[PDB]
Amino acid sequence: SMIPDFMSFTSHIDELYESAKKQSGGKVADYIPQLAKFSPDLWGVSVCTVDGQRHSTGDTKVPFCLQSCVKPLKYAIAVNDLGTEYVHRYVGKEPSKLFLNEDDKPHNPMVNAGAIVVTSLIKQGVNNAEKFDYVMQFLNKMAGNEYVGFSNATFQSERESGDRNFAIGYYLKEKKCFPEGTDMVGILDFYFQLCSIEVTCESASVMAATLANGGFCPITGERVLSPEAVRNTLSLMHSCGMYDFSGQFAFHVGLPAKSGVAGGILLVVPNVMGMMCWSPPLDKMGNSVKGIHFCHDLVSLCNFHNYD
Amino acid sequence: SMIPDFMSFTSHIDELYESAKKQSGGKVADYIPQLAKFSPDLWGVSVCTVDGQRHSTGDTKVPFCLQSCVKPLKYAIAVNDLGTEYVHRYVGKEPSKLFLNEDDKPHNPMVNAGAIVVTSLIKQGVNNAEKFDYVMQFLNKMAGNEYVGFSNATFQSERESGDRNFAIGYYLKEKKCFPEGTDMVGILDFYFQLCSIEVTCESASVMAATLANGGFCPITGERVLSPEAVRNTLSLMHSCGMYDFSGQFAFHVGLPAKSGVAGGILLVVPNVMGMMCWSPPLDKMGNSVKGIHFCHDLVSLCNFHNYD
Amino acid sequence: SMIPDFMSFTSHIDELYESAKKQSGGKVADYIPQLAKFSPDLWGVSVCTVDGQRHSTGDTKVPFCLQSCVKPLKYAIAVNDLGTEYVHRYVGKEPSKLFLNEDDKPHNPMVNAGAIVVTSLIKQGVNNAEKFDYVMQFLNKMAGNEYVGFSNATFQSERESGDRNFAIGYYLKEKKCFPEGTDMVGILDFYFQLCSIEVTCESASVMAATLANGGFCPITGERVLSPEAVRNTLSLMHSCGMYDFSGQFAFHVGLPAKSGVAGGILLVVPNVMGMMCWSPPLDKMGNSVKGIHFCHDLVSLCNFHNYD
Amino acid sequence: SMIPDFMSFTSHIDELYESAKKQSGGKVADYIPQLAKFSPDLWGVSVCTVDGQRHSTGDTKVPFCLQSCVKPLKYAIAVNDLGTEYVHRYVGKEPSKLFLNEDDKPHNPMVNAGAIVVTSLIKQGVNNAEKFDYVMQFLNKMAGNEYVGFSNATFQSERESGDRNFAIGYYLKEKKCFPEGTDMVGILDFYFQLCSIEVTCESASVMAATLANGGFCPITGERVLSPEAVRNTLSLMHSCGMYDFSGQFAFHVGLPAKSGVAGGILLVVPNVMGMMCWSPPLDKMGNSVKGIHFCHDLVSLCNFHNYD
Ligand SMILES: O=C(Cc1ccccc1)Nc1nnc([C@H]2CCC[C@H](c3nnc(NC(=O)Cc4ccccc4)s3)C2)s1
Ligand SMILES: O=C(Cc1ccccc1)Nc1nnc([C@H]2CCC[C@H](c3nnc(NC(=O)Cc4ccccc4)s3)C2)s1
User: D-chain residues within 8 Å CB-CB of A227?
Assistant: First the structure.
C-alpha cells in the first residue's frame, strides 16, 4: 500500500477535482433526450479504497446511466460463470468502424458488437426478466448494495433509436456469432436494459473497488468475482476501455478504465482503490472531458501509472 | 449491324452452347431450398436481336428467379422515372465486404445495399402492392408480355433467412441513406419480392434486348426506358455486373452483363441483341460456370468486345 | 462513321474549346519546377480522325511531357511484343494508397506500381539506351513521325525527387514482382525517362488516333499495334485512366482516356478519332480542369458515349 | 518483493525451462544465412533480479543478435535524451501491413518503420561511427559491461537483402517523417547495425533488469535510463512487443516483452527481475516457440501477471 495517510490524499483528490472543474470543453451527448437533459456543469469524483475508506466531492449522488461502463461488468460476470476459454470462443481479446475481426468474432468485449455477444452468454435459457435480475443481483454485490437503479426512459429511447445496434445484431446472427437457439432481438432488449442501469459516483466507485480488490467487495468483504474474471476485465479495460482513446490512455495513464456516453469514467487502481468520475460533457472521442483531464492529473501527481 | 445472315449465326450459337455444356464444374446455390432444388445439368441460351429475331437452345422455357439480375432493371426504372441526378444522390456509380463508400452511399446499384436503396426510390408513397404491380407492369413491357412470374416460395425463404439484408437495412437507416419517411422493413419486403420475380431465358433475352435497343422493345416497338436510363444501366452492368468478377469480365468480355444466384447471366450486346444464359451451377465468384465460359467463347469468336 | 461533314464538326470543336476556356479553376502542378513553370492559361485541343483529317485550336504546338499519358502507350507496346497472358502474370487488370492487390500484383498498368512493372517487361536484356530508342521508335510510329521530344530537365527533377517511386521500386523488388535479373534502379531510370517524353497536342492526337484505329496510324496507314494490344489498352483506359476519377469518368463520359500531371488528357473515340486536350491547371483529382469540362461537353453534345 | 527465497525460485525456473525444452515446434529464420546457421535445439533462460541475483540454465552464453529486441532499447535511449514529447512528434504510441497510421507517423517504436524513425532521432549531426559508439556505450551500461558484441556478418546480409526496409525508408522520406537534413540511407545503415548487435541471455537479462528497476542497473547501481524513458518503453513493450501476438500476449501474460527474429524474448517483470529467453525456432507469428511456452508457464505458476 502506497497511500500512507488517507486524509491528506483526499485533500489532493479535492485539489484535482477543482482543477478539472475549470475545464468547460465538451458537448453533452444528445442523440436521445434522456442524455441531452443533463447539465454540462455536473461533475463528481468518488473514491473507495480497498480498505473501505470513502471520499466524494461534487455531484456524486446524482444518478446517471452506466451505458458502456457496464461492458466490463457483464464481461466479468460471464467469465465468472463460464471461464476465459468459453467466453472467448465468442469474442476477441484485442483492440483492433468494422464489426468483426478476421476470425468473424467481435474484436473485444468493450465494443458494442462484443458486449452484445457477451450479453448472449450470461444465464442462457432463462427469460429476460430473470436474466436482468441475475445481473442486477451481481451489480448490487459489486456495489455493496449501494445505489443501483434503472432508467426506463433511456431503455425505450435507446431501443427505439438504436438502429446501429440492430444492424450489429443481424450481422452477428448472419456470421453465426451467437450460441445456437439465441433470440437475437431478445438479446438486444437485454443489452439496452443493461446499458440503462443507473448508479451514482458513490455506488460506482464501490463497483470499481471490488475490481481493484481481486473480486472482493471492500465494504462487505464478500467474494463477488473470480480472480480470473477480474484479471481479464482489468487487462481489457487497460487496452480497450476508452473508445479510440484507449491507446493514448494506456500510454499516458496506464490504468484500467472504462468510459460511457453519460460521461462516467469507471477507474481502477489495482490493489489501491476504485473510482468513478462523472461529467456529462464528452470530447470528440466520447470521453468525459473533466474525467480525462482528472485522470491525467491523478497519475502525473501520485505516480499511479502501471509502470512507475 | 454486324450479324449478316442470322441463320448461320444461330448455328454458331448452337456450337457455343454445346461447348459450354461440357463444363460440369460449379455448385448449385443451396442457402435456401428453393435454389438447392435445381438441377446442375439445366442449361439454356436465348437470343433476341434488335430486329426481333429469336433463337433458343436447351432449357430456355424453365422458369427461374431473376435474383440479382433484377438489379439493373429496377435501377433502369428509377432513372427512367427520376433521372440520373436524383437517383445518385442516394447511390454511387463505381465498383469499389463493406456496405457504404467514403461518402456514406452504397457503392453502386448492383450490390445489395445499392439495390435496396434503389428500391426505396421507386414509386414512393404508394403501398407495396401497387409498387410491385408498377414494377411488374414495367418488367412485362421490357419482355413484350412474355413470361414474368413470381416465386412466393423463394420470397418467404429469402425474407426468413436474409439476416445480412436486414443488417444492411438497419445500417442504411442509421447512416440516413433512405428518403425520409421510408419504412425500411417494408422496403426490404419489396426488395425480396423483386428478387423473387421469375423469367425464362426466352422472356429475359427480350428484356436484355430492349436494353440492347436504346429502350425500345424489339418485338413490340414500344418505348419502355429513357435513353438516359439505358445508358446508365449499361455502364454499370459493364463495370459492376458480375460480383467480384466484374473487373475481369470487363477486361476479357467487355459487354454489359448482370449475373444472379439462380445461375442466370443477363447479357447485352449494344445495338445488336439481348441474351439470357442460365445454368444453376455457380463458380466461386457466384457466376454461372457455363455462362461465364459461353460469354468468353462468344466474344473470342464473333469479336463482340466493346473495343474490337 | 457518325461525323458526316467534318467541317461543321470542327466548328463545334471550336465552340467547345471556347466554353472550356472560361473555366479558370485548378492549380498547376508544382512539385518539380519543370511543371510549375507552365502557364495556367495554356489550353489546346487537337483532333485526328481515323481518316487522317486534322484540326487544332489554341496552344496545340507547345510541347509538354506525357507523364502518365505514356502509361497506356508502353502497356500497348508490352502487350504487342508479349501478349495479354505474359504481361498480366506481372500486373492486374482492375481499378481497385496501396501498392499491390491481394495477389501481390500492381492493380493495373495505369497506376505507378503497374507502369513500373510494365516498364520492366519491355525489351529485356538490352541496356537502357536501346530500350529507350525502341520505345521512341514505337512512339514515333504511333504519331506518324510528328513531334516526339524529350525533357532532360524533368527527367532529372523527377529522378532526384521521386522518393515515392523509389519506395514503390523497393517494395516491388521485395514482393518479387519483377522478372528475375531485373536491375530495379535501372528500371526506375527508364520509368522516369518515359515519363519525360514530350509531345504536342498535334502529335499526341495522332497517337490517340492510332488507338482509335485498331492499331493503324491514320496518316501513314502503317500497322503499329496488334489488335489485342489496342483492345487491352482501351479497356484499361476506360476503367483506370483518370486517377480516382476513372469511375465517374467511365459513367459520365465513357470513353478511353488517360490524363497526366502536365495537364494532358489523351482521349480516344473508338473507330472515330483521337484527341489530346491540354491545360496545365489540375483539379483536386489531378486532371486538367479544362479537359474534364471539355470531355463532358463533347459527349453531352455529339452523343459519343460508349452506350448512346 | 514477492520472491521470498531466491533459491527455490530458480528451482522452479529450472523445471519451467525443462518443460519448454520438450516443445520442438517452429522454424528457424532463414532469410539470411546468418540466421539459418543456428541450431533448433539451442535454448537458454537467464534471470537477473532487481537485487543483482542471477541464474542461468542452458545455452545462456552463446551470442545471438538482438534484432528487434533492440527496438525498445534505442527507444528508451531516445526518450532519455529527448523526452516523450519530442520523440512522439515523430512516432505513434499505439498498436494499430501498412507503414504509417492516419497521421502519417509510424504506428509505434516496435514496428520497423517506427524503429527506423527512432534511430534518426538519436544523437543527430554526429556521423554514424560515433552514433553507434554512443548507443553501444549505452547498451553496455544497461548490461553492466557484460557481453555486447557485433555481428558484421548479419549487418551485411541484412543491408544487402533488406529491400522492405529500404522501401520503408523511401516512403518515410516521401511523407516527411524524418527530421530535416536526415541522410535516410545513412540512417538505414545505422538501423541495420543496431539490429546486428549481439548479446547472450546472461548479458541481455541484465539489460531487461535495468528496465525492471526504474532505469538502475542492478549489478552496478548506476542510473542508466530516466524514469520517464523506462515507463514509456515498458508500456509499449506491454502492448506492441510481440509482433501480431502482442494482443494475446498482453491478455494472457501481461508483462512487457519484446521478441526478435533470432528467437530472443526480452522479458521484464517490473520491480522484480529481468529475463532473456532464447530459442531460434519461431512460430508463425515470429516468436520463440519455447519462449512463448515458457512465458505462459511462468505467469500461470508464479502469478506474475500485471493484474494478479
Ligand atoms: O466506413 C466506411 C468508410 C470507408 C470507406 C473506404 C475505406 C474505409 C472506410 N465504409 C464502410 N461500409 N460498411 C462497413 C462495415 C459496417 C459493418 C458491417 C460490415 C463489416 N464489418 N466488419 C467486417 N470485417 C471483415 O469483413 C473482416 C476483415 C475486414 C477488413 C480487414 C480484415 C478482415 S465487414 C461492413 S465500413
Ligand atoms: O495511407 C495510409 C493511411 C491509412 C489510414 C487509414 C486506413 C488505411 C491507411 N497508410 C499507409 N501505409 N502504407 C502504405 C503503402 C506503403 C506500404 C505498403 C502498403 C500496401 N501496398 N499494397 C498492399 N496490399 C496488401 O497488403 C494486400 C491487401 C490488403 C488489404 C486489401 C487488399 C489487399 S498494402 C501501401 S499507405
Answer: 308
Nearest Cα residue to C119 out of C129, C109, C127: C109
A97 CB under 6 A from ligand 1? yes
Using alpha carbons only, how large is chain A's radius of gyration in Å? 18
Please enumerate in sequence order all residues whose Cβ is within 8 A of that of D104, keeping only pairs 6 or more positions apart, or say none.
Answer: D175, D176, D177
Q: Distances from the Cα of A161 to the Cαs of A155, A164, A203, A259, D15, in angstroms?
A: 10, 8, 29, 21, 58
C-alpha cell at D127: 556521423
The C-alpha cell at C201 is 497536342
| Residue B243 annotated as part of some ligand binding site | yes
Q: Whose alpha carbon is nearest atom 30 of ligand 2?
A: C102
- Sorted by where each begins, the domain ranges of chain A are 1-308
In whole angstroms, give the CA distance from residue B54 to residue B56: 7
Residue B179, phi then psi, degrees to nearest 5: -60, 140
Cα–Cα dist C259/C68, whole Å: 6
Long-range CB contacts for residues A288-291, cutoff 8 Å, separation at least 24: A288/A26, A288/A259, A288/A263, A288/A264, A289/A23, A289/A25, A289/A26, A290/A20, A290/A21, A290/A23, A290/A26, A290/A43, A291/A20, A291/A259, A291/A263, A291/A264, A291/A265
CA D76/CA C4 separation, integer angstroms: 77
Residue C77 CA to residue C83 CA, distance in Å, equals 10
Q: What angle do CA A43, A44, A46 make, to 5 degrees?
A: 165
**Cα D238 from chain centre:** 12
CB C237 within 8 A of CB C230: no
CATH number of A1-308, picked from 3.40.50.720, 3.40.710.10, 1.10.940.10, 1.20.1000.10 = 3.40.710.10
Which of A31, A116, A174 would you mutate first to test chain B, the one with the most B CBs within 10 A? A174
A271 Rama class: left (phi>0) / alpha (psi -120 to 50) / beta: left
Q: Is the CB of A167 under 6 A from ligand 1?
A: no
Q: What's the reported resolution, in angstroms, to a tenth?
A: 2.7
Q: Which of C230, C235, C270 sits opposite B251 (nearest CB)?
A: C235
List of residues 6+ apart from C293 with CB closer than 8 A: C19, C20, C23
**Alpha-carbon radius of gyration of chain B:** 18
**In the structure, which protein residues have their CB atom closer than 6 angstroms to any atom of ligand 2?**
C 97-102; D 97-100, 102, 171
